């Protein structure tokens, strides 16, 4: 406790005395965040290194132990610059510019160390509840007690405080506080997989203000801590590794629910409206489609039209009208048909590229699976579910089996997928 106090003091002085030019940036960010009810703080590591190298060295070697001290320093500063108290413990989000480590280069040498890596999100779980403030009572003497928990990896006391039993204590669920927990699954970048190896996956955990931030198929950059948890596999003394997320950078501006709101600052909106006023914007957009392909101007114009898309209408009688464009290319070999499909995948914010030979109706529309634990049936998305609000590029379309190809008829026009299997009867949206 005689070192934790000095650590908290050092962090508070960093927050309150850092200045560049003529503005306390980290003091102003806290006040601006408090006004819009954002209880968090983002710190760049380069500033921390510049301020004092000892503070950075303390954090770099003991993250799980030091980070909560910075967490409480932030909320001590906030109550001073906001109040002369329903302020929960704040959150720290970190930014780093260090070298990125591949997933397959992570091993026993990197345990309990902060790392930076990139990958592809393949699945997002549901939100779960974790306790922070626990109200506790004993089964016999019946007196009140409290416990405070931080999520940086505790149990009820195996005793009694004031005969009572061994560990007699129950949780009073009312007057207890909880936060949001989410689990995500990662995968390697397809071009970084070694020779003859299948891609591997990893598990990550996010908390509080970093939940509902990514969607499956997204390419992201993750800053977090590489840790292990004992659980459960006949090996002796083996543990399972995972990553606790501290910072997320995502290419797609869309959040989990795609709020359909502007995420553009005025500095970019001005650029976009200036671009829109160009008298020859059509030619500029057309010339940007696959600049390494000669000719084929009409196909590129069609691709631009498909990328922008039409309008969608709803009528009083419940009718729905499609507002998306579908394009077919039936031609001779060697005419760059397959080099435009992979370009449309890159340019589109949301896009999936599939082959007709290696495909199936379940893989394209939706599948039904059985949970090993619960032993019930649930629905899992497919190619047309992932590529919602985007584009799906189906190559070798003529080689598709006749059973699999007919499953796309409803999704192409009615933009819905009807499943009536195993006691599950639902209709899912698919606008692609």
């Amino acid at each position: 406790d005689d070192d934790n106090t000095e650590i908290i003091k050092s962090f508070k002085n960093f927050i309150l005395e850092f200045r560049l030019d003529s503005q306390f940036i980290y003091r102003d960010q806290l006040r601006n965040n408090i006004l819009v009810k954002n209880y968090s703080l983002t710190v760049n590591m380069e500033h921390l290194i510049g301020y004092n190298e000892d503070i950075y060295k303390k954090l770099s070697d003991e993250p799980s132990d030091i980070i909560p001290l910075f967490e409480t320093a932030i909320t001590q500063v906030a109550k001073r610059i906001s109040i002369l108290n329903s302020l929960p413990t704040f959150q720290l989000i970190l930014n780093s510019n260090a070298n990125q480590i591949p997933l397959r280069d992570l091993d026993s040498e990197h345990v309990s160390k902060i790392v930076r890596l990139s990958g592809i999100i393949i699945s997002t779980s549901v939100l779960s509840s974790r306790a922070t403030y626990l109200s506790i009572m004993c089964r016999n003497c019946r007196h009140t007690t409290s416990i405070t928990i931080n999520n940086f990896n505790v149990s009820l006391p195996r005793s009694c405080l004031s005969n009572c039993g061994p560990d007699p204590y129950i949780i009073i669920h009312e007057s207890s506080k909880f936060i949001d927990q989410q689990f995500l699954k990662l995968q390697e970048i397809p071009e970084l997989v070694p020779v003859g190896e299948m891609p591997r996956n990893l598990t990550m955990t996010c908390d509080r203000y970093l939940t509902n931030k990514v969607i499956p198929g997204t390419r992201v950059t993750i800053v977090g801590i590489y840790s292990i948890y004992n659980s459960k596999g006949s090996g002796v003394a083996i543990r399972t590794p995972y990553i606790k997320i501290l910072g997320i950078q995502s290419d797609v501006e869309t959040s989990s629910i795609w709020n359909s709101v502007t995420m553009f600052t005025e500095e970019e909106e001005e650029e976009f409206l200036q671009l829109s006023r160009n008298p020859k914007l059509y030619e500029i957009l057309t010339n940007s489609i696959a600049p390494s392909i000669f000719g084929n101007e009409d196909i590129k114009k069609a691709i631009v039209c498909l990328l922008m898309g039409g309008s969608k209408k709803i009528l009083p009688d419940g009718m729905r009208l499609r507002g998306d464009i579908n394009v077919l290319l039936l031609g001779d070999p060697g005419t760059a048909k397959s080099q435009l499909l992979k370009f449309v995948e890159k340019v589109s914010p949301i896009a999936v590229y599939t082959s007709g030979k290696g495909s199936s109706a379940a893989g394209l529309t939706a599948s039904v699976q059985r949970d090993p634990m619960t032993r019930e049936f649930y629905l899992e998305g497919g190619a047309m579910v992932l590529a919602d609000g985007g584009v799906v590029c189906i190559d070798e379309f003529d080689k598709m089996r006749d059973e699999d190809r007919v499953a796309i008829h409803e999704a192409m026009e009615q933009q819905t997928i009807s499943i009536a299997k195993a006691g599950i009867t639902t209709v899912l949206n698919s606008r692609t």
């Binding site: 601006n32 006004l35 819009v36 954002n38 983002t42």
Partner: protein
């Protein structure tokens, strides 16, 4: 009473329910029925620049103004329960101007006690979101500015611009 105000002109063109109290031939383009004359006790939605005057000239006037859908008991209860979270844009894009207009035509002290409280409680959130100047080194603002009336956007823009100019002058190096 601004003749050249654009927003007043727009807000004055909204449609209000009303009932004809007489029987008169020659009309019908109000109903989009050219040849058909209008009957007695007919309920139509007429624009405000017409229904306001038709309810004054007669004695009993030619037309009676019916209670609007935007001033029902449900909307008042929703306003009273939670002022900030309510989406006034969906109810009507010109809620406040029509509110003062309705108070002026029909003296209603109850509505004047509710609209004032609604405005006073939303002003605090407006100021909180306007004062939050970003620093280079949220979902709340985007969500809130989509629930703003036409009048409140002007105040938000003015406050935001003033704050940005003050901050710019303070930190000019």
């Amino acid at each position: 009473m601004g003749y050249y105000d654009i927003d007043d002109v727009l807000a004055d063109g909204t449609e209000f329910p009303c009932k004809f109290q007489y029987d008169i031939p020659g009309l019908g383009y109000l109903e989009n029925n050219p040849g058909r004359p209008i009957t007695k006790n007919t309920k139509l939605s007429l624009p405000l620049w017409l229904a306001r005057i038709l309810a004054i000239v007669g004695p009993v006037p030619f037309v009676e103004l019916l209670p609007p859908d935007m001033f029902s008991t449900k909307v008042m209860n929703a306003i009273k329960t939670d002022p900030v979270a309510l989406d006034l844009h969906s109810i009507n894009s010109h809620f406040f101007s029509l509110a003062i207009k309705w108070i002026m035509l029909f003296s209603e002290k109850e509505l004047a006690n509710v609209v004032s409280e609604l405005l006073l409680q939303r002003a605090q959130e407006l100021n909180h979101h306007a004062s939050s100047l970003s620093i280079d080194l949220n979902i709340a603002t985007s969500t809130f500015l989509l629930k703003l009336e036409e009048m409140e956007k002007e105040i938000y823009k003015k406050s935001h611009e003033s704050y940005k100019d003050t901050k710019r002058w303070m930190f000019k190096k």
